[PDB]
Design an enzyme around this catalytic site. Structure first.
Site, mmCIF file in Angstrom:
data_model
loop_
_atom_site.group_PDB
_atom_site.id
_atom_site.type_symbol
_atom_site.label_atom_id
_atom_site.label_comp_id
_atom_site.label_asym_id
_atom_site.label_seq_id
_atom_site.Cartn_x
_atom_site.Cartn_y
_atom_site.Cartn_z
ATOM 1 N N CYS A 46 -7.371 2.054 -8.456
ATOM 2 C CA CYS A 46 -8.374 1.287 -7.622
ATOM 3 C C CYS A 46 -9.301 2.117 -6.818
ATOM 4 C CB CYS A 46 -7.118 0.646 -6.516
ATOM 5 S SG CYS A 46 -7.925 0.160 -4.807
ATOM 6 N N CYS A 60 -9.390 2.076 -2.911
ATOM 7 C CA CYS A 60 -8.383 3.012 -2.428
ATOM 8 C C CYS A 60 -8.777 4.477 -2.505
ATOM 9 C CB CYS A 60 -7.024 2.916 -3.313
ATOM 10 S SG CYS A 60 -6.528 1.099 -3.617
#
Ligand SMILES: [Cu+2]
Length: 107
Positions: free
Chosen positions: A32, A35
């Site tokens: 991600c 993230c």
């Protein structure tokens, strides 16, 4: 990452986090992009609020049981716990300033 608490599926007994105080939990994964973008911001928050707020992370690839318990559909998702109970959440990346705003609104 030295001031961040590493959580696993065993850290929760249902939807109750088995830890005290105010705790901001980042649900994340290495694949991600957003993230990875917030990780340094979480490090700064963990430093600046040391003793007042605990910052923790739950990697959903390594710990796939927990996110479904909270109906989490995307990452990063930040859940703010107060005394083991969810008190706030935020889905998606945000800036340092926005994270401080979010915390101020809740704490
Ligand atoms: Cu560190």
């Amino acid at each position: 990452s030295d001031k961040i608490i590493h959580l696993t599926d065993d850290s929760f007994d249902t939807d109750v986090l088995k830890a005290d105080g105010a705790i901001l939990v980042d649900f994340w994964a290495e694949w991600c992009g957003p993230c990875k973008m917030i990780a340094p911001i979480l490090d700064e928050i963990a430093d600046e609020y040391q003793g007042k707020l605990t910052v923790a992370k739950l990697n959903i690839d390594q710990n796939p049981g927990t996110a479904p318990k909270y109906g989490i559909r995307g990452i990063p998702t930040l859940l703010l716990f107060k005394n083991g109970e969810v008190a706030a959440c935020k889905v998606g990346a945000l800036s340092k300033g926005q994270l401080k705003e979010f915390l101020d609104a809740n704490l």
